[PDB]
Amino acid sequence: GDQRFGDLVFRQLAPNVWQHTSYLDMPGFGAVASNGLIVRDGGRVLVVDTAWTDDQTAQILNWIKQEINLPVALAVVTHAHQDKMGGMDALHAAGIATYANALSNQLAPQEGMVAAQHSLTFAANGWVEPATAPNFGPLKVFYPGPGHTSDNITVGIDGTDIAFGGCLIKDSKAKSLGNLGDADTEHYAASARAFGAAFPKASMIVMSHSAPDSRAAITHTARMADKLR
Ligand SMILES: C[C@H](CS)C(=O)N1CCC(C(N)=O)CC1
Ligand SMILES: [Zn+2]
Ligand SMILES: [Zn+2]
């Protein structure tokens, strides 16, 4: 099922949704997979997260050209770490409009990232302010609160059973919450549960560092974060 395309992997999740996977060596972790999404919305394509590097991100765009052959209207990136924003320059070189949490754009320079062109802001309840996410189509963007990072955001795909937790959510058999160096241990558990409650009918939970899982990924991630506070 999985399509190897250069050094990346692509997996169809639904008629209009694919997971992109790219890898980077991290001493002490091995070659770490990071997952994002590609969504076809009618005559255009929407991307969630870059790959780790510009070169890998250009390869995502090459795959889109070969397998979908429609323009990429925008990309939204889910926090200011390299696995999610490392390929911003490749998107900009391709003329793609890019979006991130305002706080991700604020943090990007100190994190070694290039900021997105546009900043999303969020209501007190976590839902994106709609005027900051124009033309997002089926992408429903939700800020669950600080957790994996202060800026992490999540995305549901209307018309599917899919919600993307990014690096906030780990799989239902995961053993650790991963990189906690920028995390908010006090609010993580609540933020994970807020993601689940924002997308209550999503039965396929996509995440950055594990293959797609059931909603038990949310309950398990929350149950592990419950131990952090
Ligand atoms: C660069 C990314 C940003 S989230 C990172 O810190 N990682 C990769 C995932 C790894 C894991 N197994 O969770 C933890 C270390
Ligand atoms: Zn991260
Ligand atoms: Zn990550």
Swiss-Prot record:
Of the parent protein, the shown chain spans: 42 to 270 of 270
Q: Which GO terms describe its biological process?
A: antibiotic catabolic process; response to antibiotic
* E.C. no: 3.5.2.6
Coiled coil: which residue ranges?
none
What name does the UniProt record give this protein? Metallo-beta-lactamase type 2
Organism, as annotated: Klebsiella pneumoniae
Top-rank lineage group of the source organism = Bacteria
Q: Which gene produces this protein?
A: blaNDM-1
Q: Where does Zn(2+) 1 bind?
A: 79, 81, 148
GO cellular-component term (any):
periplasmic space
Additional facts recorded: Enterobacteriaceae carrying this gene (identified by PCR) have been isolated in Sweden, India, Pakistan, Bangladesh, England, Scotland, Northern Ireland, Australia and the USA. The organisms they were identified in were K.pneumoniae, Enterobacter cloacae, E.coli, Proteus spp, Citrobacter freundii, Morganella morganii, Providencia spp and Klebsille oxytoca. In India most isolates were from community-acquired infections rather than hospital-acquired infections, indicating the gene is widespread in the environment.
Q: Any idea what job this protein has?
A: Confers resistance to the different beta-lactams antibiotics (penicillin, cephalosporin and carbapenem) via the hydrolysis of the beta-lactam ring. Does not confer resistance to the polymixin colistin or the fluoroquinolone ciprofloxacin.
**Listed cofactors:** Zn(2+)
* Subunit structure, interactors included: Monomer.
